């Protein structure tokens, strides 16, 4: 009963050389590709990478795998995949990717009766996403996923999208493991890259991300604003509290510098300064300005000490010069 399909597979793999691409001496093997993004994984800012789980499909025509039988499509397992020629697709910006094999190699092979193949695989690609954190945390990146054909030159193997390029990378609705960004849309391109060996066709897929500033407002922005405001309320105190105004100033300085130190975790040690660092520096300057004002008042103290004019001018100008800066900093970036 099952002998008819067994001799079909035996007639297929007889005289078959898997070391040779289809049409090695006659044409170019065109590989049709599409990617189903099952789950866009978390983006590691410190390592400048991102994770993605996808159903990589490759389709190509093999004329040596023609058969005439009672079944049009041979839905086969992963053992047949290693006995035939498959393209050597690798990821150009990948770092460490895993082809899942629990409980059996997670792959697919459907030979139609003309020679068209379909080779799907489940993969979790950790790819390089180079980041430009000059507008951190109100930044938007385009993390690429480049893939091509290790060893197969443009004259041998070319790659193409099997659907329209706007519709050839599909992201599932429930598949979003991003807890910091949000995936704003996909973008593909196809190019020709040159190396020491030859010209290769490279397929680039861009994933346009955008950071959500909800963690950092509560993490640093709002504590730094409250640290400034708690230094702002020291001007309403008694002029002669030589030590009370002192503690306000030194504890605002301590909280400001520990917020400045702690607001550098999980993003890499870049040489430049982020927008959050500029907010840190301006709030730091407004904290130290309170101690400069208190040192001036304590230098100018001596039947009863009177209210300092430096204190009355700092009760109005110091909250207003903070309100000017926040309307400038939160427009400059949040605008676009």
């Amino acid at each position, epitope marked *: 009963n099952t002998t008819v399909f067994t001799r079909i597979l035996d007639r297929l793999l007889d005289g078959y050389d898997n070391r040779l691409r289809p049409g090695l001496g006659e044409r170019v093997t065109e590989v049709k590709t599409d990617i189903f993004v099952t789950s866009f994984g978390p983006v590691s800012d410190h390592d400048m990478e991102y994770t993605i789980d996808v159903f990589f499909r490759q389709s190509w*025509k093999d004329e040596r795998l023609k058969f005439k039988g009672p079944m049009t499509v041979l839905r086969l397992n992963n053992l047949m995949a290693s006995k035939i020629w498959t393209p050597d697709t690798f990821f150009h910006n990948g770092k460490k990717s895993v082809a899942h094999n629990m409980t059996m190699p997670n792959k697919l092979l459907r030979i139609t009766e*003309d020679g*068209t193949l379909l080779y799907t695989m489940r993969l979790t690609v950790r790819a390089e996403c180079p980041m430009h954190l000059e507008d951190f945390p109100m930044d938007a990146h385009a993390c690429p996923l480049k893939f091509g054909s290790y060893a197969y030159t443009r004259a041998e193997v*070319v790659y*193409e*999208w099997t659907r*329209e*390029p*706007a519709r050839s990378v599909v992201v599932a609705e429930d598949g979003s493991r991003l807890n910091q960004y949000d995936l704003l849309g996909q*973008t*593909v*391109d*196809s*190019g020709i890259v040159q190396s020491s060996t030859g010209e290769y066709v490279v397929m680039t897929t861009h994933f346009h991300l955008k950071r959500k500033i909800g963690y950092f407002v509560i993490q640093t922005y709002l504590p730094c604003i409250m640290t400034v405001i708690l230094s702002q309320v020291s001007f309403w105190l008694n002029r002669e509290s030589v030590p009370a105004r002192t503690v306000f100033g030194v504890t605002t300085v301590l909280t400001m510098t520990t917020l400045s130190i702690s607001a550098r975790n999980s993003l890499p040690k870049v040489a430049y300064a982020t927008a959050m660092d500029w907010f840190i520096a301006v709030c730091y300057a407004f904290v130290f300005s309170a101690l400069i004002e208190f040192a001036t008042v304590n230098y100018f103290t001596k039947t009863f000490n009177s209210v300092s004019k430096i204190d009355r001018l700092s009760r109005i100008a110091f909250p207003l010069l903070f309100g000017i800066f926040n309307l400038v900093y939160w427009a400059t970036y949040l605008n676009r």
Partner: antibody
Amino acid sequence: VQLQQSGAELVKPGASVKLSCTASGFNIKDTYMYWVKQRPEQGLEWIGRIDPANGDTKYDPKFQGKATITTDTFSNTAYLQLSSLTSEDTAVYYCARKGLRWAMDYWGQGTSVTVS
Amino acid sequence: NIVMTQSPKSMSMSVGERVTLSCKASEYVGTYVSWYQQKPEQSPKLLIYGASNRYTGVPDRFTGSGSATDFTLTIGSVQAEDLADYHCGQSYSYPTFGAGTKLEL
């Protein structure tokens, strides 16, 4: 490598016309087939899409309903069905093979339709 | 859709000099445009695929150039047999084209 089309047509407005092109040198199940409209002294207007291996069709929203595309495997031939012909439908039609990097490689000679 | 807005409508120059066209895209099309010639009483033939890729049989004088949105086609030392009509397409989405550019003496 050659795309041969039918002859020119001349029917009354409000009728329907059958228009065809037969592909040679390859099989239509591999590459997509594209239909396009060339009005005289105007630009190209894409009609629709067909994938013959899958049977899927996608159409221009201004051409939806009034034009549909069919295929058959044995004849290696793509067809048009035009309905409710008017004065603005007087143009010349080409069927296009999808080529390398989706570029419309091969074009049929062109089939002229005329209403009266 | 994607709207191709190639400019100008017609150019009238002599034989043996440099002339360039310009194709503008309303949305992002990434190196997926195409360039065709349209002789009178003749079907279109492909010239450029991708963004700047010369098709087989095209002379070396026909050089394109591409980007994410702005596209151009440069002609070097145009001859008399190149006097035809040029069209810009795209295929990053469902395909559209542009009105076209003509050439005159």
